[PDB]
Write an enzyme that holds these catalytic residues in place. Structure first.
Site, PDB file in Angstrom:
ATOM      1  N   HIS A  58       0.862  -1.177   0.000  1.00  0.00           N
ATOM      2  CA  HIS A  58       0.000   0.000   0.000  1.00  0.00           C
ATOM      3  C   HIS A  58       0.899   1.228   0.000  1.00  0.00           C
ATOM      4  CE1 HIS A  58      -2.357  -3.065   2.172  1.00  0.00           C
ATOM      5  NE2 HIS A  58      -3.434  -2.490   1.675  1.00  0.00           N
ATOM      6  N   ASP A  87       2.337   1.936   3.365  1.00  0.00           N
ATOM      7  CA  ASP A  87       3.337   1.002   3.887  1.00  0.00           C
ATOM      8  C   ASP A  87       4.744   1.442   3.511  1.00  0.00           C
ATOM      9  OD1 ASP A  87       1.288  -0.798   4.677  1.00  0.00           O
ATOM     10  OD2 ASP A  87       1.392  -1.868   2.744  1.00  0.00           O
ATOM     11  N   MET A  98       2.553  -5.797  -7.949  1.00  0.00           N
ATOM     12  CA  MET A  98       1.245  -5.284  -7.575  1.00  0.00           C
ATOM     13  C   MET A  98       1.425  -4.206  -6.524  1.00  0.00           C
ATOM     14  SD  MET A  98      -1.166  -5.402  -4.937  1.00  0.00           S
ATOM     15  CE  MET A  98      -1.380  -6.911  -3.975  1.00  0.00           C
ATOM     16  N   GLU A 105     -10.763  -6.545  -4.901  1.00  0.00           N
ATOM     17  CA  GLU A 105     -10.702  -7.558  -3.863  1.00  0.00           C
ATOM     18  C   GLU A 105     -11.978  -7.566  -3.048  1.00  0.00           C
ATOM     19  OE1 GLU A 105      -7.145  -7.495  -1.726  1.00  0.00           O
ATOM     20  OE2 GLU A 105      -7.827  -8.882  -0.160  1.00  0.00           O
ATOM     21  N   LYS A 121     -14.647  -8.654  -0.043  1.00  0.00           N
ATOM     22  CA  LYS A 121     -14.669  -9.153   1.334  1.00  0.00           C
ATOM     23  C   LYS A 121     -16.081  -8.964   1.853  1.00  0.00           C
ATOM     24  CE  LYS A 121     -12.294  -8.906   5.813  1.00  0.00           C
ATOM     25  NZ  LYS A 121     -11.571  -8.122   6.836  1.00  0.00           N
ATOM     26  N   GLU A 145      -9.400 -13.419  -2.234  1.00  0.00           N
ATOM     27  CA  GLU A 145      -8.610 -13.830  -1.088  1.00  0.00           C
ATOM     28  C   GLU A 145      -9.257 -15.053  -0.446  1.00  0.00           C
ATOM     29  OE1 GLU A 145      -6.991 -10.967   1.782  1.00  0.00           O
ATOM     30  OE2 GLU A 145      -7.656 -12.296   3.406  1.00  0.00           O
ATOM     31  N   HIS A 151     -11.396 -14.503   2.642  1.00  0.00           N
ATOM     32  CA  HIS A 151     -12.575 -13.643   2.511  1.00  0.00           C
ATOM     33  C   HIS A 151     -13.777 -14.403   1.981  1.00  0.00           C
ATOM     34  CE1 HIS A 151      -9.852  -9.833   2.448  1.00  0.00           C
ATOM     35  NE2 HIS A 151      -9.747 -10.544   3.561  1.00  0.00           N
ATOM     36  N   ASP A 177      -4.915 -13.598  -3.612  1.00  0.00           N
ATOM     37  CA  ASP A 177      -4.367 -13.513  -2.260  1.00  0.00           C
ATOM     38  C   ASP A 177      -4.543 -14.866  -1.564  1.00  0.00           C
ATOM     39  OD1 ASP A 177      -3.740 -10.732  -2.446  1.00  0.00           O
ATOM     40  OD2 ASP A 177      -5.143 -10.139  -0.884  1.00  0.00           O
ATOM     41  N   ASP A 204     -11.521 -12.083  10.020  1.00  0.00           N
ATOM     42  CA  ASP A 204     -10.490 -12.380   9.018  1.00  0.00           C
ATOM     43  C   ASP A 204      -9.188 -12.742   9.732  1.00  0.00           C
ATOM     44  OD1 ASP A 204      -9.327 -12.117   6.309  1.00  0.00           O
ATOM     45  OD2 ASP A 204      -8.891 -10.018   6.721  1.00  0.00           O
ATOM     46  N   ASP A 232      -6.331 -14.383   8.409  1.00  0.00           N
ATOM     47  CA  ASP A 232      -5.091 -14.221   7.644  1.00  0.00           C
ATOM     48  C   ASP A 232      -4.015 -15.200   8.147  1.00  0.00           C
ATOM     49  OD1 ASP A 232      -6.444 -12.196   6.139  1.00  0.00           O
ATOM     50  OD2 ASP A 232      -4.926 -10.660   6.625  1.00  0.00           O
ATOM     51  N   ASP A 234      -1.330 -12.844   1.453  1.00  0.00           N
ATOM     52  CA  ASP A 234      -1.860 -11.768   2.289  1.00  0.00           C
ATOM     53  C   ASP A 234      -2.174 -12.441   3.619  1.00  0.00           C
ATOM     54  OD1 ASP A 234      -2.913  -9.615   3.529  1.00  0.00           O
ATOM     55  OD2 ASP A 234      -4.598  -9.308   2.174  1.00  0.00           O
TER      56      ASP A 234
HETATM   57 MN    MN Z   1      -5.983  -9.335   0.681  1.00  0.00          MN
HETATM   58 MN    MN Z   2      -8.017 -10.994   4.880  1.00  0.00          MN
END
Ligand code: MN
Ligand code: MN
Ligand code: MG
Ligand code: MG
Ligand code: MG
Ligand code: MG
Ligand code: MN
Ligand code: MN
Ligand code: MN
Ligand code: MN
Ligand code: MN
Ligand code: MN
Ligand code: NA
Ligand code: NA
Ligand code: NA
Ligand code: NA
Ligand code: NA
Ligand code: NA
Ligand code: NA
Ligand code: NA
Lengths: 387, 387, 387, 387
Positions: free
Chosen positions: B53, B56, B87, B180, B182, B216, B219, B244, B254, B256, B286
């Site tokens: 991002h 980041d 990406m 993406e 979710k 993802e 998700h 992802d 979520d 992850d 991710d």
């Molecule tokens: Mn993701």
């Molecule tokens: Mn996630």
């Protein structure tokens, strides 16, 4: 109070009030109903019409003479009551031949049979005046990963729907198709599991204008999704051709509770959306009176579906008409959400210092949305507790 | 054994291994990582690249000179390691200004700012060589029904994506967008909650070819959906631009988890599908090393993501190459599923007595699918227990 | 209308209205509140009292002089308003030291510290007049199967609670403990995930009479369970020592919506049960004003919690008092459910031909339960639509 | 490889391999099996025994002479094969008379009949050598809030189980009871929905030592719970009298997939726990071969249940025996979790400065748990990918 009228367009499947009560663990608790009985009883409650699967109206395997007599009796009941038949569908799920699917069965001979069974019933639906033909692919899917190649299955599902579109075009019929998503049950996972997946699939058909969705309250809630949001996306796409109304308590087996049961606030927001958007289609109930009930309870449950819709309609209309709510909607900037972000165009946006260098992010972030006050006005209106 | 190689194309977000461990109830458990550190450590594990991002890589609010220095250091690390940046994405969710959304915030000034923030980062992504620009609209949605008119929000979301498409076209960029989905979290319900809803939305954009999905694992599983099935629909539509990879234990927040954790058999079927279909994009993780871990555990968790992909790749390839499995696939009629239902055409199907009058439904229904034997061969291959 | 009174006993955690809005993806949207502010504002809304974690009232790491000053200011606010403190609890979840648990951390030194931190706060709770000490073991659990031996963890959890019971007994305190279950979040799975598991655990403590449950609406709903049913089992066991009221939309992350939001019909049945059973404890709200809100929205959301309880109380009382509902309850045999099956005893039952050889199962099976009519009377009462 | 042996104690319900394939939407796909056939086929696969509901073995309504002949044929098959009958149960769910429950039906006459039906079958179970009598109260519950007063229903459920305990005591039988929880399906919510709720209820029975739990993998997973954790609590309580093994894909209708399907990693951790704890009871499969299958697929699915248990047993044993895993368990402080927190006692803990004033919380918080390395060793062992 809260009396149904013909303009309400409330409809019921024959299989709803006619459900005999067999479940995964239990035998039938009610005798079978003659469709003629159901038509007359529903009319007495203020329903507008009924819907049917082929095999609800004509026992599977009936001779041509038997088929004619079943249809003749049904049409007499419709004529005796003024009830309409706005929608019909095919049963491609009960008979053992459909255990791996109809249109996406691995066996090609079954796929061909499923199409012929559907086509025969499209002809009947048109003869009865139906505007919409629903497809619920309840057997399309799998319990295991190797059993079904989903890209191949989607090719077969597209082929089937394309052939049905060719058929109705060739016969000059005005009927349109509505695909009913469901995430699971009776298959471990069902193809086209949500409104979104069905909308996306339709865009790849050869004649996309002939197909829309028939979303069901409880089916979207079986994936934990927001049913009003999904209906909004279907409306946005111009694809809400029909709807199935019922109740569901979250992520469980498909309960098919009467409408208003289950997630009551979602039912409120759904009615608000349908009425605000001017949805003109049937308000169709796909529900099951619980197997605890006798026939008096069947008719009470059906009456309750309509009553709850009408109560929610009143409360949602009062919410939208209340000047205090209108003020709260402006305080929450719902008016701004409806205005274009950049009708000035891309270059003007790129050149606008107020959108970047001179945007005061901390001042913007300090503004409250006032969504809680708005939602408590909505609660007060739903409960009739304004004051 | 199971050593990553550049052709594997394993990538990681800076925010994955860099997650400091703050959760809804707990403070950070790890110090912040310099992106340079993460690039060098990931390269040592055999990763191919990283993703970011905007915020980041460049602290929010940085001056132009600070921005240049952060990018210069990052590019030196990429050059020192051979790591790529396939990406990038925009953070439209952390800062309080985005509390009601970016592209679909009720406040128009916020929508315009969100677009300008994204456009600035698209320029940077292109400079770093990214082929895909992801959009995760984590703040697009609502906790209450009156707060967000979803048809209006979809109009604003389309307007935003159309403007971004106009932008990249006007600059001659080759980058493409990946949305993406979710279903929820951090909003009570998020707009475009599944792969299906995102695919359907894309079809209504002005330049649909510029947009695909970035699904993802976790998700889709937060809605209880079958992730391999959704990936199959994205592949069928030609829209799997990025993916992802992670793990999730069902319908929860979520998580992850590292890839392979959570639903292990779904991970197997996913890898089988990606490899069989020839997916050529990044295998992007991710994920979040749990906050229980120190930095040694961070790198162990990242290594585990890649290791698990490679084990599953081996087992899925062995499954598909086994002559006993090939025989079982034919016994289950997977070959027939891949053949057209009616290449002879509609009229021939209507005229074919073998599809209706002479179809022996009871003989067809008696045929077993042999799916359980096939699935146990799949289990034996996954576990390395053939014999 | 629907004005809170002291006899309503509505209470709020300092951390509820004081939640600054940090979520898994977003920074705080509101400044920190001084507990003195919260006490005075809640009193103005008609609340009865507040509750606290140690670290809500006294910043972690405070010196003894700082601790005294924070408590002195808080007590002055309580004295200025008449607000009470019926419950307190320990924060054994925010600080990184508790990342693997407090009482069930694998590290023994952490377990001992967690106990000492709790004991210090029990002393303070007693000084402030609290009758109940809650324990929410939010960090007790695991993300992976090898990390936590659950039998050993239950031994450690029993040891901890037994030591706390020994402590309060030794000091002559009248306070009692209430264990708050939650199924997951922030750990992948939390120990004692439901009301049932907590009730079962309590039965194995050395002094079971000192411990009960503090069930939270949304936590049971995160497992898809029926919250009124679980409260009924806690009441049946004599263990409903406290309750946390809020709203939740099903199987998601813990939303902590205001009470009445989420599952509205479950809120109705909950209030009906609490009032019918004569629950005498605090009506405590463990909720979070959404981070979209400014402080005006914080206080509106808190007011809404109390308002919704009072509306539901009115409607449930009207339901139970309506002679038509009383008749429907008899038609559905709720009176018979409350009568013993076999007060005549086992031998008489074995000798009773009416219970077996002469029981007409088909006549019994024909009787409808009339549950749908009863439920529609309940709906009509909830919505104020009787007629 | 992975051949079942008698010491494995694998058992199957007659209703598992005998399931004819009727589901909420579909007719039977397989003919009924004679119990004699099932006994002989299961023995050929290496099963140890079978279990039955009364009405699986003796058609409902059979005369005394018919009952004797059915039992005689069954016993001959057991004698011919060496198969045992370790468990039996009552069908209190299929017949319409049980539509509102057996032991907690609102109608008292039905409650009395349910008890007499159970008692008759306890006598038969003892004659066949069963050690455990299971009760699955699948009809105990409700679809609506007014239909069932849960405190009254729990009183009736306790009365029933107390009477059954009095019965077996009076006859000198050694059999014990095992209550099988399920959260929902076929009722909207079922009483005693989880292992925890059942354990808590048992503690309030008059002779608690006579009752334990029969947890089912898929039922706990229908609430999104961790099945190994729940089994650990049952073992901790001394109440794991029997177990039902199968697979489930999360929060859905009860799928009853073969064991190892569904959540494979949870199956691994379950087998690890049962074997480590020395569980000595039957490894009983309550599963359904999918209705897609013919009889060859039925027997393949049953064989797969046992095979998967044996593969997981091997892998879990190798995990626990690996010196690298033993080192990782010590690195993660699993040894410390098993040691008392404060065997020195409360006063010593209160006096220990190392537990409070001199506890270095930041040094403790810096220690990583190394759980990810441990979990990847577990994954490598499960997949046979060590190296
Ligand atoms: Mn993701
Ligand atoms: Mn996630
Ligand atoms: Mg408008
Ligand atoms: Mg192919
Ligand atoms: Mg009473
Ligand atoms: Mg031990
Ligand atoms: Mn349904
Ligand atoms: Mn439907
Ligand atoms: Mn909560
Ligand atoms: Mn709470
Ligand atoms: Mn089951
Ligand atoms: Mn079972
Ligand atoms: Na194909
Ligand atoms: Na439409
Ligand atoms: Na608009
Ligand atoms: Na693609
Ligand atoms: Na221990
Ligand atoms: Na109580
Ligand atoms: Na009672
Ligand atoms: Na035990």
């Amino acid at each position: 109070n809260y009396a149904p009228t013909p303009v309400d367009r409330f409809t019921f499947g024959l299989w709803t009030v006619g459900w005999q009560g067999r479940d995964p663990f239990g035998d039938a608790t009610r005798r079978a109903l003659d469709p003629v009985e159901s038509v007359r009883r529903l009319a007495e409650l203020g329903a507008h019409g009924v819907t049917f699967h082929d095999d609800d109206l004509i026992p599977f395997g009936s001779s041509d003479s038997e088929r004619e007599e079943h249809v003749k009796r049904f049409r007499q009941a419709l004529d005796d009551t003024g009830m309409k038949v706005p929608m019909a569908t095919t049963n491609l799920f009960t008979h053992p031949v459909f255990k791996d699917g109809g249109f996406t069965a691995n066996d090609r001979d079954v796929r061909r049979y499923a199409l012929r069974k559907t086509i025969r019933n499209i002809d009947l639906a048109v003869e009865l005046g139906a505007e919409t033909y629903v497809a619920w692919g309840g057997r399309e899917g799998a319990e295991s990963g190797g059993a079904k190649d989903v890209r191949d299955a989607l090719d077969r599902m597209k082929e089937a729907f394309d052939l049905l579109g060719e058929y109705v075009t060739s016969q000059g019929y005005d009927i349109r198709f509505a695909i009913e998503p469901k995430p699971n049950q009776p298959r471990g996972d069902i193809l086209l599991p949500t409104v979104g997946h069905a909308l996306a699939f339709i865009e790849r058909l050869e004649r996309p204008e002939l197909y829309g969705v028939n979303p069901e309250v409880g089916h979207e809630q079986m994936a934990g999704l927001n049913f009003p949001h999904g209906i909004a996306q279907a409306l946005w796409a111009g694809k809400l051709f029909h709807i199935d109304l019922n109740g569901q308590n979250g992520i469980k087996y498909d309960q098919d509770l009467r409408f208003g049961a289950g997630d009551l606030r979602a039912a409120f927001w759904l009615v608000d959306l349908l009425e605000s958007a001017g949805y003109s289609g049937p308000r169709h109930f796909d529900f099951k009176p619980p197997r605890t009930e006798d026939f008096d309870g069947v008719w009470a449950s059906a009456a309750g579906c309509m009553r709850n819709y009408l109560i929610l309609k009143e409360r949602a209309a009062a919410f939208r008409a209340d000047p205090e709510v209108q003020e709260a909607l402006r305080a929450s900037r719902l008016d701004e959400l409806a205005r274009p972000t950049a009708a000035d165009g891309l270059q003007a946006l790129l050149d606008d210092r107020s959108a970047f260098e001179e945007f005061d992010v901390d001042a913007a972030a300090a503004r409250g949305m006032a969504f809680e006050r708005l939602d408590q006005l909505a609660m007060d209106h739903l409960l009739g507790a304004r004051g």
